[PDB]
Design a binder for this molecule. Structure first.
Ligand SMILES: C[C@@H](CC1CCCCC1)NCc1ccccc1O
Lengths: 101, 316, 241
C-alpha cells in the first residue's frame, strides 16, 4: 500500500513511454517520492532512519525501471536503423572483370 | 647429387591453386597475415556465441587457450592491433585451418582449410582524383566474385541473406555453390563492432577452401558470325525480391536466342510505389546460324516479361 | 587543334598492391627449389595423435623427447603436432618407393621468448629410393643453402641425434658475427621408421631434413624479432611486397 502503489503507477507509466519522455515520468515520480520523504516529518524518531531507507529503496526501484526502459528505447532505435539498412545481397558486386591468358 | 628416375607427377588442369587465389587478393589490395591458431575464448565467444571450442588444458595463456572455430577472431584482432597504431584502413586475408569439434571426424575434431579476410576504412588511400568513401558490402562482394570467377563456376553461386550472430542482419549473406553453403560474408554487427572496439564499419568473409579448389577446364564452343541485338526492359517488382533471381529467370526461361542478361540500374522513389523497385535489364539476343529480325526479337522479350508476371510483378 | 594538356606525372587511378607474408615468401622459394627436383608438396592436419607424431618416428612412450618436448596435449592421445610427420608417414604407407615429398606446415611448442613463439612453421623433406646416401644428403642441402642465401657461403655438417634418423646431423651456416648458426637438422631415415611403414631398409634407403621458416626468413631479410611475424603490423608486412 502506497509504498508500492506509487511504484506501481510509476513502473506502469514508464512502460508505455513511446518517445524519450521517460524523464517526464522521472520528474513526476521524483516529486511524488520526495513528497513522500516529507511525510516522514513525524513517526517515532528511532524509526525515522528506517522510514528513509524504505523510501530510498523505493526510489532506487523506480530509477532501475527508468534505466531499463531507456535501454529498451535506445536498442529499439538501433534495431530500427538496422531494419532500414537492409540491402539486396544478391546484387552484383563492384569489380572489374578478370582477364585470361 | 642424387641419382633417380625422372618420372613426372600426376597433374590435373582442373586444380585451382591457393597461391593463384592469394595472388588475385594481392592484386585487389589485400595483405596476407598469419595469426595464431589458438585464440582468446572470451572474444571468440563474442563472435561465435554458444559454439563450444576445443580448449587446451595447459595453454601458454588463457588468451591463447581455444582452438579457433574460424579465422575471424585472429583477423579482427589484427585490425584492432593496426588501428591502435594509427592505421584505420586495413584489408587483410589469411589461409589456415579451423578446428570444429566433430564426433564423425578423425580424433573427434574436424580441421578444414579456410580462406578468410576483412576490409575496413575508405575504399582507397587519399588520392587527388578519388573521393573518400567508406567500404561497403558490394566492395567485398566484388572481390569475392573475382575469387569465385577463377573456378569458372560463378554462374552457379548464390548470395542468400542468412542470419549470423556476428553480422549485420540486413547486410549479411551465406555463399552457396551448387546448393552447398561454402562460406559467409557481411558487415560486422554494430554491437559486435562496439565490443571489439572497432573504429568503424568492418566487413569479413570466410570460405571453405576445398569447395572451390576445383575449376572448369575450358571447352571451345562455336561463336556466331551473325550480329546480335539488344533490348532493354524496365521491370517493377517487390522490394524484397532478389534481383539475381529475376536475372536468373530471364537467362533460364529464355532459349538459346538470348545469350546475355545484365542489370544496369535499380530505381525506387518518385515514380515507383513504396516497397517496390524498378530493375532496368538489358537482354542480348543472337543465333549461331542466322540473323534475327524485329518479329522474333520482340516476341522473345515479350516471352521473358510474361515469365515475370506470375512469379513476380508486371513491367513499366 | 584542341590542347587538353594534362600533367602526366599525377598519381594513376588504382588500388595499391597487397603482398604475401614473409614466411610465405620463404616457403614458396623452398617449394620451387625442391619442385624442380621432383619433390611433391604434401600437407596434413595440425592436430595429430601420439602415433603419427611419436611412435611412428621411433619415439616410444618412455622416450625423453616426448614428455620433455614442450608439447601441447589435449588428452593422452590427441596433441598439437610438433612436426609435419603425419603426412610423411601416411604417404610411405600408401605407396612403395620412389618417394620424393616436402611437407610444410605449422607446428607447435610451449616455449615463447624473443626467439621463440608457441606456433611456427616447419619445412620437412623426405626422399626414399634404392641407393640414397649421406653424400646425397650433403649435396642436396648444400645446393639448397647456396640457392636460399644466393652466395657460396660456409656451411658445415655436424653430428647430432634424432630418434627417426641414423646417422643424424645438423647443418650450420657461418654467421655474420663469426659464429656458426644452426639452420636445419637432417639424417638418413632410421630402419625402424622404414620398417613400420612397410619399406625394406635392406633394399631402400633415404634421407630427411627439417628447418624452421621463421629462422631462415630472419636470416634472409634481416628481421631481428621473431614476434614481428605474428603481430602482423601492416608496416612490417608491407616491406615484403
Ligand atoms: C620429424 C621429422 C619426420 C620425418 C623423419 C623420417 C621419416 C618420417 C618423417 N621431420 C624431418 C626431420 C629429419 C631429420 C631431422 C629433423 C627433422 O625435423
Amino acid at each position: 500500500e502506497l509504498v508500492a502503489s506509487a511504484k506501481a503507477a510509476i513502473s506502469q507509466a514508464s512502460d508505455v513511454a513511446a518517445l524519450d519522455n521517460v524523464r517526464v515520468e522521472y520528474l513526476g515520480k521524483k516529486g511524488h517520492l520526495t513528497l513522500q520523504m516529507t511525510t516522514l516529518r513525524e513517526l517515532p524518531p528511532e524509526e525515522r532512519p528506517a522510514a528513509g531507507a524504505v523510501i530510498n529503496e523505493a526510489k532506487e526501484q523506480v530509477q532501475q525501471a527508468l534505466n531499463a526502459r531507456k535501454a529498451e528505447l535506445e536498442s529499439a532505435a538501433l534495431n530500427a536503423r538496422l531494419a532500414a539498412e537492409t540491402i539486396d545481397v544478391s546484387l552484383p558486386g563492384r569489380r572489374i572483370e578478370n582477364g585470361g591468358l | 647429387p642424387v641419382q633417380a628416375s625422372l618420372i613426372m607427377g600426376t597433374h590435373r588442369e582442373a586444380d585451382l591453386s591457393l597461391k593463384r587465389v592469394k595472388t588475385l587478393l594481392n592484386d585487389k589490395g589485400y595483405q596476407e597475415v598469419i595469426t595464431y591458431s589458438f585464440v582468446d575464448p572470451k572474444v571468440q565467444q563474442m563472435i561465435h556465441p554458444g559454439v563450444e571450442a576445443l580448449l587446451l588444458p595447459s595453454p601458454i595463456s588463457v588468451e591463447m587457450s581455444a582452438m579457433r572455430l574460424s579465422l575471424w577472431t585472429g583477423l579482427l584482432a589484427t585490425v584492432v592491433y593496426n588501428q591502435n597504431r594509427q592505421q584505420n584502413r586495413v584489408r587483410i586475408f589469411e589461409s589456415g585451418l579451423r578446428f570444429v569439434p566433430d564426433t564423425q571426424a578423425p580424433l573427434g575434431i574436424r580441421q578444414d582449410l579456410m580462406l578468410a579476410g576483412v576490409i575496413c576504412g575508405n575504399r582507397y588511400e587519399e588520392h587527388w582524383n578519388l573521393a573518400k568513401e567508406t567500404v561497403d558490402f558490394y566492395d567485398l562482394k566484388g572481390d569475392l566474385e573475382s575469387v569465385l570467377d577463377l573456378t569458372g563456376k560463378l554462374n552457379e553461386v548464390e548470395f542468400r541473406a542468412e542470419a549470423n550472430p556476428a553480422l549485420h542482419p540486413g547486410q549479411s549473406a551465406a555463399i552457396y555453390l551448387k546448393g552447398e553453403r561454402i562460406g559467409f560474408v557481411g558487415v560486422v554487427h554494430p554491437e559486435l563492432e562496439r565490443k571489439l572496439d572497432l573504429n568503424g564499419r568492418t566487413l569479413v568473409f570466410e570460405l571453405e577452401w576445398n569447395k572451390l579448389a576445383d575449376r572448369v577446364v575450358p571447352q571451345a564452343r562455336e561463336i556466331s558470325r551473325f550480329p546480335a541485338n539488344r533490348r532493354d526492359i524496365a521491370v517493377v517488382v517487390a522490394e524484397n525480391v532478389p534481383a539475381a533471381d529475376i536475372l536468373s529467370e530471364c537467362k533460364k526461361v529464355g532459349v538459346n536466342q538470348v545469350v546475355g542478361v545484365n542489370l544496369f540500374d535499380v530505381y525506387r522513389g518518385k515514380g515507383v510505389a513504396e516497397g517496390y523497385k524498378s530493375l532496368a535489364i538489358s537482354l542480348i539476343l543472337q543465333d549461331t546460324s542466322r540473323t534475327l529480325e524485329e518479329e522474333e526479337i520482340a516476341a522473345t522479350v515479350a516471352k521473358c516479361v510474361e515469365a515475370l508476371k506470375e512469379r513476380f510483378q508486371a513491367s513499366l | 587543334l584542341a590542347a587538353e594538356t594534362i600533367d602526366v606525372s599525377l598519381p594513376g587511378r588504382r588500388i595499391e598492391n597487397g603482398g604475401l607474408h614473409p614466411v610465405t615468401r620463404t616457403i614458396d622459394r623452398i617449394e620451387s627449389f625442391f619442385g624442380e627436383l621432383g619433390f611433391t608438396v604434401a600437407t596434413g592436419p595440425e592436430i595429430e595423435d601420439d602415433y603419427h607424431n611419436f611412435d611412428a618416428l621411433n619415439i616410444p612412450g618412455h622416450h625423453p623427447a616426448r614428455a620433455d618436448h614442450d608439447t601441447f596435449w589435449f588428452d593422452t592421445t590427441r596433441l598439437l603436432r610438433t612436426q609435419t610427420s603425419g603426412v610423411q608417414i601416411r604417404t610411405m604407407k600408401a605407396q612403395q618407393p620412389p618417394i620424393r615429398i616436402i611437407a610444410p606446415g605449422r607446428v607447435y611448442r610451449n616455449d615463447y621468448d624473443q626467439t621463440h613463439t608457441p606456433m611456427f612453421h616447419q619445412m620437412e623433406g623426405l626422399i626414399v629410393d634404392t641407393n640414397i646416401s649421406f653424400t646425397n644428403l650433403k649435396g642436396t642441402l648444400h645446393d639448397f643453402l647456396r640457392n636460399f642465401f644466393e652466395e657460396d657461403l660456409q656451411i658445415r655438417f655436424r653430428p647430432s641425434y634424432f630418434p627417426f634418423t641414423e646417422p643424424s646431423a645438423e647443418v650450420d651456416v657461418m654467421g655474420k658475427n663469426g659464429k656458426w648458426l644452426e639452420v636445419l637438422g637432417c639424417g638418413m631415415v632410421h630402419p625402424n621408421v622404414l620398417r613400420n611403414v612397410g619399406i625394406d631398409p635392406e633394399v631402400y634407403s633415404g634421407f630427411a631434413f627439417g628447418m624452421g621458416m621463421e629462422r631462415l626468413t630472419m636470416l634472409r631479410y634481416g628481421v631481428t624479432d621473431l614476434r614481428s611475424f605474428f603481430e602482423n603490423d601492416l608496416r612490417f608486412l608491407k616491406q615484403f611486397k
